[PDB]
Amino acid sequence: ETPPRFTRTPVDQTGVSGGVASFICQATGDPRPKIVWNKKGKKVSNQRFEVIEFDDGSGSVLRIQPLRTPRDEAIYECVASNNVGEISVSTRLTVLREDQIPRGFPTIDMGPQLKVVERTRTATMLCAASGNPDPEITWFKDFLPVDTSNNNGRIKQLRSGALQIEQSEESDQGKYECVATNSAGTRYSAPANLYVRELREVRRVPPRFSIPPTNHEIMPGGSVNITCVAVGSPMPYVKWMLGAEDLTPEDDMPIGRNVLELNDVRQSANYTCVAMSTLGVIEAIAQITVK
Amino acid sequence: ETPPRFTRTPVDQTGVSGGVASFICQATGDPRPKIVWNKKGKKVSNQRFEVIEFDDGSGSVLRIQPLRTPRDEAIYECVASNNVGEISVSTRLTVLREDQIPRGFPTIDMGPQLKVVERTRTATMLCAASGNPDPEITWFKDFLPVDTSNNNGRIKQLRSGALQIEQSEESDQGKYECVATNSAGTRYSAPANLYVRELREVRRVPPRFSIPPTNHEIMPGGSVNITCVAVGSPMPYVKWMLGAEDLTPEDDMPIGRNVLELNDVRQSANYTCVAMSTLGVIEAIAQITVK
Amino acid sequence: PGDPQICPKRCVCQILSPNLATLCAKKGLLFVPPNIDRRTVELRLADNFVTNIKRKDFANMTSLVDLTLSRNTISFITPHAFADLRNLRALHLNSNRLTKITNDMFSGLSNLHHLILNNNQLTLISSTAFDDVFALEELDLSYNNLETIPWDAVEKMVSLHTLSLDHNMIDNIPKGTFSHLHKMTRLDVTSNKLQKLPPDPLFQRAQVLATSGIISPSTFALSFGGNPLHCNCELLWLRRLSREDDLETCASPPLLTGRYFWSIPEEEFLCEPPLITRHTHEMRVLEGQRATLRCKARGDPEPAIHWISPEGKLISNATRSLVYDNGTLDILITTVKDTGAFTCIASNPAGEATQIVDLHI
Amino acid sequence: PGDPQICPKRCVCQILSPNLATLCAKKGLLFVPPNIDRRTVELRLADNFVTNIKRKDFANMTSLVDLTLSRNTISFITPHAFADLRNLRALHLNSNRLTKITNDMFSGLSNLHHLILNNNQLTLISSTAFDDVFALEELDLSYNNLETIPWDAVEKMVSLHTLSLDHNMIDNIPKGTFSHLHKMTRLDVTSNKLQKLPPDPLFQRAQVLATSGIISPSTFALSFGGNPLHCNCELLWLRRLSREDDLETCASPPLLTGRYFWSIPEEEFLCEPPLITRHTHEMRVLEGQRATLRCKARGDPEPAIHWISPEGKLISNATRSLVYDNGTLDILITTVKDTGAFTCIASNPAGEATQIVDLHI
Ligand SMILES: *[C@@H]1O[C@H](CO)[C@@H](O)[C@H](O)[C@H]1NC(C)=O
Ligand SMILES: *[C@@H]1O[C@H](CO)[C@@H](O)[C@H](O)[C@H]1NC(C)=O
Ligand SMILES: *[C@@H]1O[C@H](CO)[C@@H](O)[C@H](O)[C@H]1NC(C)=O
Ligand SMILES: *[C@@H]1O[C@H](CO)[C@@H](O)[C@H](O)[C@H]1NC(C)=O
Ligand SMILES: *[C@@H]1O[C@H](CO)[C@@H](O)[C@H](O)[C@H]1NC(C)=O
Ligand SMILES: *[C@@H]1O[C@H](CO)[C@@H](O)[C@H](O)[C@H]1NC(C)=O
Ligand SMILES: *[C@@H]1O[C@H](CO)[C@@H](O)[C@H](O)[C@H]1NC(C)=O
Ligand SMILES: *[C@@H]1O[C@H](CO)[C@@H](O)[C@H](O)[C@H]1NC(C)=O
Ligand SMILES: [Ca+2]
Ligand SMILES: [Ca+2]
Ligand SMILES: [Ca+2]
Ligand SMILES: [Ca+2]
Ligand SMILES: [Ca+2]
Ligand SMILES: [Ca+2]
Ligand SMILES: [Ca+2]
Ligand SMILES: [Ca+2]
Ligand SMILES: [Ca+2]
Ligand SMILES: [Ca+2]
Ligand SMILES: [Ca+2]
Ligand SMILES: [Ca+2]
Ligand SMILES: [Cl-]
Ligand SMILES: [Cl-]
Ligand SMILES: [Cl-]
Ligand SMILES: [Cl-]
Ligand SMILES: [Cl-]
Ligand SMILES: [Cl-]
Ligand SMILES: [Cl-]
Ligand SMILES: [Cl-]
Ligand SMILES: [Cl-]
Ligand SMILES: [Cl-]
Ligand SMILES: [Cl-]
Ligand SMILES: [Cl-]
Ligand code: NA
Ligand code: NA
């Protein structure tokens, strides 16, 4: 009926030794175009070459892992063929080894990690990259390019390289990969898994002081015990501070109760008891005045 | 026929807690006198009380090991009885514990050790003891008093507490015990074994120099090697000395060969090579003269 | 090469297989016998009292294949004692007193398919100690004191079938250890200190799960049961597997302490988002001086602390700056280029949380 | 005292025997369960992963008799954790990671007939550690790193049946150890470092020697076969025994190296008399000063160096003088009373040899 047409074509790519590369080729036509990937004049076959069809059926994705230099250096060919037509596209893959990496090549400063999100909540897969020039961040889920398009939809990429998925579905879980690209080449971050679990709702109570810090009056030279207790869900960490000076280290942070025992302070200052939880921070004042 | 008679009688003794004590009682008569040992009016019986008859049959020896205070403190009675007579002797045993020991009580400074001697050779069982007054040394072999009498015989006790057995028989081997006695009491040394083995004769060669030290002339500042080799049966240790200064430590003493390599000595001295064996010592002179 | 057939005085040598055999097993040897025909293919020294392996002992043996030192007293092996055997396929050092694996130990081995160290006292392994042998089919470290092993050398063995770490002190397994490693049948982590386990396709194939009327085999055998598992979302992938119950138990968090791992429902495995405990609100120091920035955040698991320069991306260990493990930031030479608003970010599998510090120079 | 019968959640408790049993064996516990009925007579924690014994765990158990911690990971036991059990007759700690026996460990035990420490990593035992239990019938130290144990406490247990030291590093056994010991069936020293063995009536009863047609039972079982025996006259008493051949081997002297102990004829067991290697001919130092006298003698075995004051029986560590191991003599305060001819004497089982040094002050 209608000969095929290229809706999307690959681009020249450059990668490291042991990295990966992806060429996206999708086409339209009636009949559905048959996508072929060729190295020289023959269809690609090897243990490291993996073709991934699109869920649309419009095309596939050629993924090469890992990258072997100079075995994989060559020109590659996408072929969209059907009953009434055959059409082709070419792209060039160059792979340089680990000591051939120039400065400014995309490097992933912070890669994504394991992330577990409840269903219909917001999951954020972090990424950070640098290089000269500043690299562009793209995402791949299950060897397929993530669609970050600003067209109204769920998946949105942030100002930082981090990817954000609101209202997480079950099909959102999989293997995510961060991809930094610039004029110097293309670099993939280490893969990270996103686990989607069923929603469990539980009453979340912000911190409130069960026992607020009690104003105490002791003449200089003495020692007093100030009881400061806080409650909530989650139960907040309790910490004492004189001004900006933390009076307990982060190693031991009593969750239930924190009492402040002062040593022979003959001058006057205002002490602050703090209760910290993921639901926000509350702080109350205890006034010790020396006469 | 003839009523009995006491040829030897025990004496009052004093010992420590855990030590031993021996009471020697031997008699003559026709019939042979029956020797009995009594505690109070009854024959002694207990796990620690052991009577040892004499090879002569004249009498026995009462040996108490170990000493239990105050269980063993009592008067003891030797009884020589036969057909026509019964006669008795008494002696007192006092035993004081380890914290009751007065200063000057006999103490064994060096006790006997394991000694293995070839048959018909001289074995010497060492002992040393001190106290106030100076203690007297007596010996016990296999719970029996050793006869050290100057009457012509094999076994002889030395000026030192050491016992000496010339022309060692096979019956000489056994358990020997050194006994120090004075006005303060009686103390036994730790028991030691003498092992009598068959005579093996080998040709004994006193040391002779196979390579005597060679007189060497080297101008000051140089370094020379002097070859000194000695031979013998046993093969003598070889050691270098400058005057009285040993040039090799006792840890490494080469048996076969010792070479003296001199370091930048610009003055003159006479060097001595020494070969030492149980067969005596030989020493030769190597001359180094600096010009 | 043509010579007579020599045998140790106390051993029994057999020509019966075309491979020359020298059997010293259970002969009460205190040391490796000096006279052994260098043509020996199979040498059994096992069940002897030898405390030391000198270089002379195993030297210039070309055809040796099996060498069994098992059940000896060996506390020491001279470096390059095994340099000589290019054909050795199996070395049994098991049931010995070795406290260390030196880098020169096994530095001549290549074609080795079995290295059996099990039931030794080893507290440490040199970083390069395993670099010489990448061909190992089996590596048995069982029953040792090891806190960790040179993992990057372990993943460099692609022929590895079974790795036995069981009954050791191992802290953790790196995430990318088994990534490109294949042909691996078995891994035994039992009786170790592991709090968590990294995901991996092999561990996805450790489970047996199938619909009724269909049978799914197990291509990978994995036993972690002996560890003080810290049970949170990080182990959720493991809890979702369908496996036998080996009675592994959760040590932490305190709510799950004592509970069996497979008894706890998936929803109860819980990790908690980061919460920033401490900060330095504002800081003033001049140029070219020692500076310190405090950011400390807590959570389950303990969150990762990273920094953000003003209107910038990420700091790191670098020429102009240094980052630490406990979260402190040291700019060794401060500059007016660094004046501005720094952002502290703390990341967790549950989420992330940020605060801000301000710096004027 | 009358109460219900409580059981740990993960264990199985049996009232079948009038002795209350609590069986936790193979339950995968990481720690001692907090709830155990204090009336338990028989408690099996064996084959579990416990790494720590807290004081609270075994506290206020009156009737406990058997306690098996075998095959655990325990590296630490809180002092007086066992203070509470006065009725404990058996304690199995075997197959654990303990590196030390503290003095407060087992400092509550009394009536104990079995202490099983075998297959641990212990390198040391406190001097007073065994002082609390003198009632031990069986002490099993097998498969450890011990160089020596508190022997003077071992000889204070007169009920000791079997002492298993096998597969350890033990240097030597003191001579007067086993004199106080009685009712002792078995001693296993195998796979140790012992050079020699002390004579003893028990070891005289270890042999089986009889005329043809007569069978001799061995009242005492003794295995030393795993040791680097130094073979000289000191072992002659042992060579004269008629025993089975366990393939013990002489490490030294070099002439006997590698020879089987029982193959060597008695006449070939040779110790050599002392020979004085070094001396200080004459010495002059004034009164009240540091003085040193060198006498060093060699031989097989190494001879014992002793000193003789001019016209005197002997010296000792004392107020006026001190003697050392290597043979040097230190008179800290010299006096004109010490002026004279000193005699140095070196003693050996073969013989003794003397030399003379002269001192003027
Ligand atoms: C701090 O304490 C002083 C005296 O102790 C007091 O005057 C002042 O009001 C306190 N601060 C506040 C904010 O009330
Ligand atoms: C010591 O050396 C000197 C000069 O070399 C020589 O005259 C003297 O004879 C030597 N001593 C002896 C005892 O020969
Ligand atoms: C290997 O060593 C032995 C003894 O060390 C020697 O006899 C032999 O010649 C050596 N082989 C080679 C190829 O050098
Ligand atoms: C960064 O430095 C810290 C200490 O300054 C060190 O612990 C860490 O391993 C370093 N990391 C890298 C990737 O260099
Ligand atoms: C952080 O680590 C540094 C060294 O790496 C140390 O000097 C500093 O005291 C530590 N601070 C805290 C709060 O742990
Ligand atoms: C034993 O200790 C427990 C708790 O430590 C206590 O409840 C109990 O009363 C104690 N029993 C005795 C007899 O002291
Ligand atoms: C004598 O000295 C040695 C070492 O100098 C020491 O080991 C020994 O205990 C001392 N003897 C006494 C009785 O203290
Ligand atoms: C001998 O031992 C003493 C202490 O025991 C030491 O001070 C001295 O250096 C030693 N001398 C030698 C030659 O070993
Ligand atoms: Ca040959
Ligand atoms: Ca090397
Ligand atoms: Ca194989
Ligand atoms: Ca190293
Ligand atoms: Ca553990
Ligand atoms: Ca935030
Ligand atoms: Ca009860
Ligand atoms: Ca105590
Ligand atoms: Ca019993
Ligand atoms: Ca101690
Ligand atoms: Ca040994
Ligand atoms: Ca002499
Ligand atoms: Cl058509
Ligand atoms: Cl390939
Ligand atoms: Cl909510
Ligand atoms: Cl008559
Ligand atoms: Cl009695
Ligand atoms: Cl002779
Ligand atoms: Cl075997
Ligand atoms: Cl050796
Ligand atoms: Cl062993
Ligand atoms: Cl069992
Ligand atoms: Cl614990
Ligand atoms: Cl274990
Ligand atoms: Na062994
Ligand atoms: Na275990």
Residue numbers in the entry:
A (entry chain D), B (entry chain E): 21 to 311
C (entry chain A), D (entry chain B): 14 to 374
How is this structure described in the published paper?
SALMs, also known as leucine-rich and fibronectin III domain-containing proteins, are a family of newly characterized SAMs that belong to the type I transmembrane proteins. LAR-RPTPs are type I transmembrane proteins and share a common domain architecture of an ectodomain containing up to three immunoglobulin-like (Ig) domains and up to nine fibronectin III (Fn) repeats, followed by a transmembrane domain and tandem intracellular phosphatase domains.
For the SALM5/PTPδ complex crystal, the asymmetric unit contained one dimeric complex, in a 2:2 stoichiometry, where a central SALM5 dimer bridges two monomeric PTPδ molecules together. The complex has three dimensions of ~120 Å × 100 Å × 75 Å. In each PTPδ-bound SALM5 protomer, the Ig domain keeps its long axis perpendicular to the platform; the two Ig domains in the PTPδ-bound SALM5 dimer are in parallel with each other and no contacts are observed between them. In the 1:1 complex of SALM5/PTPδ, the Ig2–Ig3 domains of PTPδ adopt a U-shaped configuration to half wrap the SALM5 Ig domain, with one end of its Ig2 domain docking to the junction of SALM5 LRR and Ig domain. A total of 2540 Å2 SASA is buried in the SALM5/PTPδ interface that can be divided into three principal regions, sequentially named site I, II, and III along the primary structure of SALM5. Since K309/R311 and E365, respectively, inhabit Site II and Site III of SALM5/PTPδ interface, these data suggested that the two sites are both vital to SALM5/PTPδ interaction. In conclusion, we have determined the crystal structure of a 2:2 SALM5/PTPδ heterotetramer that yields insights into how a SALM5 dimer induces cis-dimerization of PTPδ for their function in presynaptic differentiation.
